[PDB]
């Protein structure tokens, strides 16, 4: 099978500078070469078809170019609708072989994180079950730390964190973290609370509830 | 205008056979190849193979020899794809795509033994100018869910999460941010919908 490879898995870049994104095949591929765009939800679609012709509909910063097994995918003016992952795919000969892609990631203006917390549903404590959510919603960059207290002492068995893509229309990162625990062992305690700590701030962005309260 | 529309996600037993298909519509159906991809998470994609409708005939990838079979149906403009002696390698993303280069939305194949669990839906209320509420969506087998707010009304300002696996089932939330005028005051709802379990579900979020 014909190898194809891609420079880099991820590159990084900010709105309406440009990118390029590069292929080498193992073998000469004579200028068949496709550049796919895949966004998140996983939609794919055909941006530059033969090495550098552009389908009916893609805008023309988007250009390809090389040849042999050396083949580019430059992008002008990057804009947010252009965060996802790109890949090459060769046919000139079977079977047909795809790279594995290069997300695209889109630099931005430094935002703190929406934070907030939510106490278990009635409804859920009946099922004898009880999940504390928490979404630190909308922050850049990437990296957050969230840590759970109770009854105020540190807290981490029964967390489970989860984090979205890089958001297509502001750019932003979204995570929730949910700490799941018995309904038993929710009533046994009074206080939760949600603590994150991101670039934004050294004090950390603190929410709790007390069940007393309401 | 060129579409390809493929069948909902799937889930199967060890040992069946699925067929999934691929419903064309704004082209000549026979005059194009029609391709068949999958990406499985973690590996990028794999070429299955091509079928020319005109005449039923097929070029496979070797590696998909014996377990794919392509055919394609003229009268209703529609490819499929047989897939056989399932295991779980054989879970992942399958796409449907001509040469011409036009893509199916993907369809979610999962191969278990386990059983179907639907999911059990909360309201996330909570405990401002703009309000964030959530759902959670909890305990459900195997992916997909779709998550909806009121209908596919509520649109910008949505966080639906990846779900997370455990014991054998899946849980994810997703969260909204809306104005202090419309909730409580209004009803506002999250729509979740989980196929494999042929069920769907809308919660109030009503104050605590």
């Known amino acids: 099978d014909i190898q194809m490879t891609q420079t880099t898995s991820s590159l990084s870049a900010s709105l309406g500078d440009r990118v390029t994104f590069s292929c080498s095949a193992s073998?000469?591929?004579?200028?068949?070469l496709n550049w796919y765009q895949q966004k998140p939800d996983g939609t794919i679609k055909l941006l530059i078809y033969?090495?550098?012709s552009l389908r009916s509909g893609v805008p023309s910063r988007f250009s390809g170019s090389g040849s042999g097994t050396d083949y580019s995918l430059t992008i002008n003016n990057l804009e947010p609708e252009d965060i996802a992952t790109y890949f090459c795919?060769?046919?000139?000969?079977?079977?047909?072989?795809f790279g594995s892609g290069t997300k695209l990631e889109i630099k931005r203006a430094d935002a703190a994180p929406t934070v907030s917390i939510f106490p278990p549903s009635s409804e859920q404590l009946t099922s004898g079950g009880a999940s504390v959510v928490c979404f630190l919603n909308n922050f850049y960059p990437k990296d957050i730390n969230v840590k759970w207290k109770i009854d105020g002492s540190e807290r981490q068995n029964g967390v489970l964190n989860s984090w979205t893509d890089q958001d297509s229309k502001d750019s932003t990162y979204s995570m929730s973290s949910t700490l799941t625990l018995t309904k038993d062992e929710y009533e046994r305690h009074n206080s939760y609370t949600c603590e994150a700590t991101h670039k934004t701030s050294t004090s950390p962005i603190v929410k709790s509830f007390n069940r007393n309260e309401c | 205008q060129v579409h390809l529309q493929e069948s909902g996600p799937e889930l199967v037993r060890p040992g069946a056979s699925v067929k999934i298909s691929c419903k064309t519509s704004?082209?000549?159906?026979?005059?194009?190849?029609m391709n068949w991809v999958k990406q499985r998470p973690g590996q990028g994609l794999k070429w299955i193979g091509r079928?020319?409708?005109?005449?039923?005939?097929?070029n496979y990838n070797e590696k998909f020899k014996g377990k794919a079979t392509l055919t394609a149906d003229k009268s209703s403009n529609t490819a499929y794809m047989q897939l056989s002696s399932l295991t779980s390698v054989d879970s992942a993303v399958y796409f449907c795509?001509?040469?011409?280069?036009?893509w199916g939305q993907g369809t979610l194949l999962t191969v278990s033994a386990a059983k179907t669990t639907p999911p059990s839906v909360y309201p996330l209320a909570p405990g401002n100018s703009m309000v964030t509420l959530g759902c959670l969506v909890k305990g459900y087998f195997p992916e997909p869910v779709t998550v909806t707010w009121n209908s596919g009304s509520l649109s910008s300002g949505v966080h639906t999460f990846p779900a997370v696996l455990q014991s054998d089932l899946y849980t994810l939330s997703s969260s909204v941010t809306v104005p202090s005028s419309p909730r409580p005051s209004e009803t506002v709802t999250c729509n979740v919908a989980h196929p494999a379990s042929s069920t769907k579900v809308d919660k109030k979020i009503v104050p605590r």
């Open positions: 704004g082209y000549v159906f026979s005059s194009s190849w």
């Open positions: 073998q000469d591929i004579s200028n068949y």
């Open positions: 033969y090495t550098s």
């Open positions: 795919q060769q046919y000139s000969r079977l079977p047909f072989t």
């Open positions: 795509a001509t040469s011409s280069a036009y």
């Open positions: 079928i020319y409708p005109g005449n039923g005939n097929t």
